[PDB]
Design a protein around this ligand. Sequence first.
Ligand SMILES: [Fe+3]
Ligand SMILES: [Fe+3]
Ligand SMILES: [Fe+3]
Ligand SMILES: [Fe+3]
Ligand SMILES: [Mg+2]
Ligand SMILES: [Mg+2]
Ligand SMILES: [Mg+2]
Ligand SMILES: [Mg+2]
Ligand SMILES: [Mg+2]
Ligand SMILES: [Mg+2]
Ligand SMILES: [Mg+2]
Ligand SMILES: [Mg+2]
Ligand SMILES: [Mg+2]
Ligand SMILES: [Mg+2]
Ligand SMILES: [Mg+2]
Ligand SMILES: [Mg+2]
Lengths: 165, 165, 165, 165, 165, 165, 165, 165, 165, 165, 165, 165
Amino acid sequence: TEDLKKSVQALQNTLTELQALQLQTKQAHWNVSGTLWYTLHELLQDHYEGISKFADDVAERQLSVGASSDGRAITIVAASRLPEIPGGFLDDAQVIQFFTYQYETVGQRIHQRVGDVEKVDPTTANLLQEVEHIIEKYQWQMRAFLQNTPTDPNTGFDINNGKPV
Amino acid sequence: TEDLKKSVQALQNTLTELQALQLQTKQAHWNVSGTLWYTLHELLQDHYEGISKFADDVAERQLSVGASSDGRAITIVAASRLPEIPGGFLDDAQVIQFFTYQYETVGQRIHQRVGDVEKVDPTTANLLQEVEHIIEKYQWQMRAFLQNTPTDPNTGFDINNGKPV
Amino acid sequence: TEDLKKSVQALQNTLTELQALQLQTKQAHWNVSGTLWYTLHELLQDHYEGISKFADDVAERQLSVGASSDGRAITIVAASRLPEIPGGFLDDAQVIQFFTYQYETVGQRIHQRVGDVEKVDPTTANLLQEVEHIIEKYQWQMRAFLQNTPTDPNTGFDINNGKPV
Amino acid sequence: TEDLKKSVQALQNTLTELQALQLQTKQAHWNVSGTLWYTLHELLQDHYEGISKFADDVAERQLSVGASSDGRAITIVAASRLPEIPGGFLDDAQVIQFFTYQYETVGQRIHQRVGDVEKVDPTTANLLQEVEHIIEKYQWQMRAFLQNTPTDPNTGFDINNGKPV
Amino acid sequence: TEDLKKSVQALQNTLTELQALQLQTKQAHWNVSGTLWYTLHELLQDHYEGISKFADDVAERQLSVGASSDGRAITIVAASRLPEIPGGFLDDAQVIQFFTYQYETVGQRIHQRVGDVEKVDPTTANLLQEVEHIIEKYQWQMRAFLQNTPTDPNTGFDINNGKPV
Amino acid sequence: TEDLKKSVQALQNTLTELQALQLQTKQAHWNVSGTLWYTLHELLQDHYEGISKFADDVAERQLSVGASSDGRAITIVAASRLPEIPGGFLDDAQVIQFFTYQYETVGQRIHQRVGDVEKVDPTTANLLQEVEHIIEKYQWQMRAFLQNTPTDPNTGFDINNGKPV
Amino acid sequence: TEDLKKSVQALQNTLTELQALQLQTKQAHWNVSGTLWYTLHELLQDHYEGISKFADDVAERQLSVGASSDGRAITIVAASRLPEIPGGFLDDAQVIQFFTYQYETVGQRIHQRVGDVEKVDPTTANLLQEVEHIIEKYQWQMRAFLQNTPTDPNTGFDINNGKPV
Amino acid sequence: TEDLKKSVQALQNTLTELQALQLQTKQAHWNVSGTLWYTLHELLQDHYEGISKFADDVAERQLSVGASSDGRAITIVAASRLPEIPGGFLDDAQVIQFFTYQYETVGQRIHQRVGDVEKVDPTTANLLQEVEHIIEKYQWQMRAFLQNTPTDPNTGFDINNGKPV
Amino acid sequence: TEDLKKSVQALQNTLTELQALQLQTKQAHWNVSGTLWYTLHELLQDHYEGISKFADDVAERQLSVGASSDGRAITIVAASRLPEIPGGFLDDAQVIQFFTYQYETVGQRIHQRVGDVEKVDPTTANLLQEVEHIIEKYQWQMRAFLQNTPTDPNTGFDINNGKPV
Amino acid sequence: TEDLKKSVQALQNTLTELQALQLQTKQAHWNVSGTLWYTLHELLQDHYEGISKFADDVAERQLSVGASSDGRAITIVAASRLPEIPGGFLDDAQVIQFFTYQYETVGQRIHQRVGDVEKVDPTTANLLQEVEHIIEKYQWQMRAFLQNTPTDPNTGFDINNGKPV
Amino acid sequence: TEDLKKSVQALQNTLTELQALQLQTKQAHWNVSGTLWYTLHELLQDHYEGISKFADDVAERQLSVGASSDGRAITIVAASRLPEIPGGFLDDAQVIQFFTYQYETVGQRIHQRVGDVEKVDPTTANLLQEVEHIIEKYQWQMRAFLQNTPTDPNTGFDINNGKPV
Amino acid sequence: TEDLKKSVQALQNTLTELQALQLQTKQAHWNVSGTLWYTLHELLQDHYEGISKFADDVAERQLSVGASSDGRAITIVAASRLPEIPGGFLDDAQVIQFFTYQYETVGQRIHQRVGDVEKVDPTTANLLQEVEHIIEKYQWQMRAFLQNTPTDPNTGFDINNGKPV
Ligand SMILES: [Fe+3]
Ligand SMILES: [Fe+3]
Ligand SMILES: [Fe+3]
Ligand SMILES: [Fe+3]
Ligand SMILES: [Mg+2]
Ligand SMILES: [Mg+2]
Ligand SMILES: [Mg+2]
Ligand SMILES: [Mg+2]
Ligand SMILES: [Mg+2]
Ligand SMILES: [Mg+2]
Ligand SMILES: [Mg+2]
Ligand SMILES: [Mg+2]
Ligand SMILES: [Mg+2]
Ligand SMILES: [Mg+2]
Ligand SMILES: [Mg+2]
Ligand SMILES: [Mg+2]
């Protein structure tokens, strides 16, 4: 059960982070504003859908290894380790900055969990690799808005009132 | 027939406004230009499709209460009460400003019609509520491009040659 | 630009005629009455859909050759050259007669445009050929209701109060 | 429970009428004969399908407000208030006349129920408005076969052996 | 092989009749004219499709019992036993009369084949029963246009220039 | 016409029984209650759909052999020969018992009709065999809830308040 | 803005309740156990999907009336007014009891909101009626497992270790 | 009408050739035998479907220019100009050789018709170009089985009993 | 029960044979090798799917007549009466020869069962006819690879190392 | 080839176990009886489909590493290592107990194979991880019926004649 | 063969240009960066798909006129006549400028080919017209981002670090 | 960045190889000739589609780890390490031999990359395992045409002018 504990911990911690991202992507989807609001509205709906699918797969995997899955709102608030997204109307450049950082740090933690459970539970490890893959992709998709090129640093001045993001 | 007249008037006036919006969204869809042209191209196609569906439902409702439906081009021009959209290539910021105002004022007039016919014809009133719902949504979707946030007033300078929209 | 002018003129004039037909087929779709009303209701919806698709392709082609597309209601009314359809409840035999004549004359004008632009702009000419094809088909479909046969002149007396159409 | 009684009564009475219409449209669908038999065959199948969907929604709403739904054949026969459709081969003009009258009178009774329950049960009232909408549409679709126009009274002589319907 | 001969004969004769009907329904589909032309256009396309499916099943069954299938144009012309449909524009009432008679007589012959092969080849007999079912249905659908009712003999005068069909 | 009478009788009697089952499965679908209510809700919807399809095929076959189809509510009540299902909330074990008996007895009567018409009308007989097949399947699906096994008599005590069904 | 405040309050309070239900139905979906676990697993997935669709529509409506939507996890926890669902493996009878009570009380509060906003904002009121409709349906679907019938009180003893629920 | 005659002749002659190919591809589809029988079975079904679609378009075009379409079996036999395919079981190499020649010669004749009608009827000419395109593609697909390569002359010895095709 | 025994025996024996064919077609699907391996791979997948559907229908029919269905692996091995397919890589010509013989002999036995049960159980007999139909079709599809034609005996030398199959 | 042997052994042993499960889930699907029979009928069909997909992927992987796949019925019987499921009508509680144990032990053996081949053949190991994932999920779905909760031990007494499973 | 040479040359040269565009649109799809990166990501995927479809049609046409198609990577590099797209992260404004120029010049060359082959090979000419149509459309879609309007020159300063593109 | 370098190198090298295979499978798809040309045409289209999907996933993964993706034609030619496929008409046996060797050697190199990056980047390693899986499958599908069996060495003499491949 010291092996089982490892898997359960890794899965539970991943479920909570995805659920936090679920709620944040949807909040941003509705509240985003500015030049890129519609672009981000659509992109975040796609992210919401991929995150939602993996939140299901994670919980199902917990049940599959014989553990109860804790997907409750209180647990999402409690088992934070991650900033809440601001309320109110959200600027496009603020959404981009927010998820660039959130996806990067969630991807990092899943990366570590993969190594922690590979030896005891390669099937769980394998699911977590798939989650890490989608989260790093979503990180790229947010990163790309401000990605430096030979011809243009893309500082975001145009989407952030003349100021670099 | 003083009750029937109310319903017919409310439906006819709504049909004409939707038909005007049909033609304007499609014109903007083809002619829009600038940084947001493709974004608006796609968004306006979706608006065109929701407006078209409600233009059908309105006409069908007219026939259902026993009145002929006037959907002719001459009637659209005649029964204006609404600015025509400019010809030529249209700037993205001009499209945004145009529909922000058009959807708001069309939504306002449908809002009034709902109250005018609720008592005599709640079924008609109910259709008009659905039309008001979609038009106010589309108003939001245009509004959002220039919506003020704590971090960025989103003046549209970036989509309007350095000038606030 | 004397070559470009030819193409733009042919496309614009075609767009306006299709848009006029769009509005007329839909008006007839809702208002048609009599023995054939449901038959025509369905047939005209199909015609509306094929005309609508070609109104899109025409406008897109205008943009593709570098010209703005004028699809506004005022332009439809202005750039007539074609009778408006009557308001009110419409008899089945009157719808049949109306579109038999409208499709024939629209097809004739597109036929001429094809020849006018084939040499400068065969790609545009080719689109216009496709439009002419659908309009002549729709002409047949209306014509067929009153088409003379060895066994029956099909005068339309049965759909026109005992009188030949 | 004097409020609950109102809702249950309105829903039950609506369910029975839709079920009666279900059976009558299908009977007519199979047995209709004459020039318009195939037209009516198809139209009545569509009406059957929309009525069937609303018969489901009505029963479900009854269960939702906590009442049993009575959809039995005996109840349909008992809780008449509406003519049965004749057996045997049915003429097209007789089908048209029959449903023109049946849909009009069913629509009228649902109209009244909407007002009776709006104050206590706006959610039920709202469903009944949707049912009234479809029934009035179907009334139009039957009415249209004999609708008077400037050019043709459409007496139905052609579908009724030379006699006005 | 006296048993095999029976099956092959029944299948081949059925294939040829269906192929003849294939070509005739399609010819009528294109050439039909008058008040019912569009109604018949659509109905005959559906008949064409059901006949085509059974022409495939019949040929496949021939191959399945180990015999070559003769579906050639010369065989259709040769192995007539059935009137050709007239060329030229065809009146709606003439199409109705033609298929009423053709489907009835084809159904009759398949009926006989079923009995001829039931004992040796119930699987073939069973396919032929399915073909007989569709052909008798199509016979009804043509018959229904002129079916006598208590209120209207439906003589077809309205679709046949004032003359009973 | 002594042969035709046999077919018409067999088809009509089958149509009425299916229509009775249509109404009863739907009533049970809405009103069923207890541990198995949702299971039965879904199962009975599937049964409703298969019965409905065969009620269509039966009526169509009646028309195909040249007879009017009697699908009216009065005929369903009249041409009983079968218990009505109780009104009110229905227990799961009562639904199971009811359809176990109804499907068995309907299947038995169709079995007899098949033999009665095989010689005159094998195509009709064949349709009735398909109806008998689905009804016997549905009988199994209800039977299975209380089917005796080596390890458990399945008396239904658990779904019937501690009492064997 | 005293009218706008009413609408915003009603919508926001509804959004939060649906989001709470979203998380609870999914938790129950994964963790439910016992005889009815699979039945409830499937049923709760359907409820999750209908609630999710309405959580989207509510937020969109908030944006449409010009207000930011607060869908954050902290707000769900804060703006409780509703019990959290227990963690751990959940018994089928406990899930049934939980949602029977939760849906009933959520439906009650939405019922009140409808009346509060009907006069100022009938379009919002109308959305809330649709939400109330689905929540009352889901209440029925949970209620039905323990619904009293003439033949069986359905106490749930069979799904609750021999004890009435 | 000397221009109309040209178009009608070109269309009619094309329709007949496609109809001949329709029947021949299907005959070959059923009767083909040998190593490549299944390959050819599938390929010829695809060819049958593309030819069938163009046989429809050709006939429709005839009607569209105001002429009756002659698609009768007698006309297919009469207006030959093309070999009939042999009856009986057909060898794969014989099918390949047959259609290689038939498609090549049909494509050649359509090529000529295109030039004959381009000036009077570019819309018809354009349809005929599309038919020529598909027929030349199908010619390639048959040709390819015996196409000479640097490493292998592909004489067909393997599919033709050791003899070059 | 002497009648029931007949049906059960015929169904059970058919189920086992189809299950044997299920496993053999799939084995051949994976292991087939040579010039025709891909052709056979695809063809055998289609055969697997049609056989699988009928293995379901047979078992369901057993349950429908009130008997348990024995579909266990031990029963497939036991209730042989049919050669097992060789293990290892399988040559295309060996697959063709194998199924040509297996389908022919399975079809023969089902043919006999049809006659054995027609009188007691025409509904079962009818299912078995459908199974016999598909098995004889599949027999043709294998036979066709080596079918003798006027121009080529198709000995299979090309797919069998220069030797006739 | 000592590395290849490992992979082939792991794949073959997995294929056989999945094929055994294929046949057992389907047998249970048809024969299951009692309160949960329909629930299990549906659940086992889903399990059958996921197992079938993985039986295909496993065999394909064997071929991909260059080995023949042994999927024959004799091999399933021979290469047991697993209990056969009983014949006859099966009780719901017996099905639940059977697969709870079978899936657990199959999952355990695949778990071991993953470790055995990870180093030589990570691609094969990866497929086997996916198989282990689905089998452990299916284990959960069977386990859940008798899963202990704070409020109810779920002994299965209700589905097992008053006795704990 | 001087006519054949013309067609082959025109087709081959077109194939190579489309293949070059295939690779460039996909490269840009992955590497594009900045405010418009996601907009362009999606747009370029659509362009990739339309170009890919025409690269297939062109090659197929080459085979159809009896010539081998050269679609190899070496030929794409060799038969340049067109700039390669830069490696590395690409700015949105650089992608827009690149394809604006590439599509314009590819469209120009196809325009010329159409004239070169119209007389010998109108079917090929016609395909090339369709390719020219899509390429000119894609040119518009890139052009539109910087299209001058009465209210805004759209210099691209906002997407190009404050500098006009 | 010594870890990042490893991943980028492995991904880039894989992307280039897949892109080379993309172009080669499509070239072979169009140009393949002989007895197996159509079989290979279809098979290679499927291979093209699976390779294309993985070329997308690889590039996306490169972007996801923060590196630019080089998918340019020059890079495909440059970063060869693999033979180009010959131009001109290609014999079936030459296509089979070519891809048998190409897929085997590409699969081998991806196998090595998996090991090189597993420790630093298991998510990348995992994608590469999926690519290796599809490439080894495609290798089998080409291998199978010439796979040795107990009854036939399958030398390919029949597809290679009497000579072993
Ligand atoms: Fe509504
Ligand atoms: Fe059948
Ligand atoms: Fe074209
Ligand atoms: Fe994976
Ligand atoms: Mg901003
Ligand atoms: Mg601008
Ligand atoms: Mg009239
Ligand atoms: Mg009549
Ligand atoms: Mg006539
Ligand atoms: Mg009970
Ligand atoms: Mg319990
Ligand atoms: Mg041969
Ligand atoms: Mg061989
Ligand atoms: Mg039990
Ligand atoms: Mg930039
Ligand atoms: Mg060769």
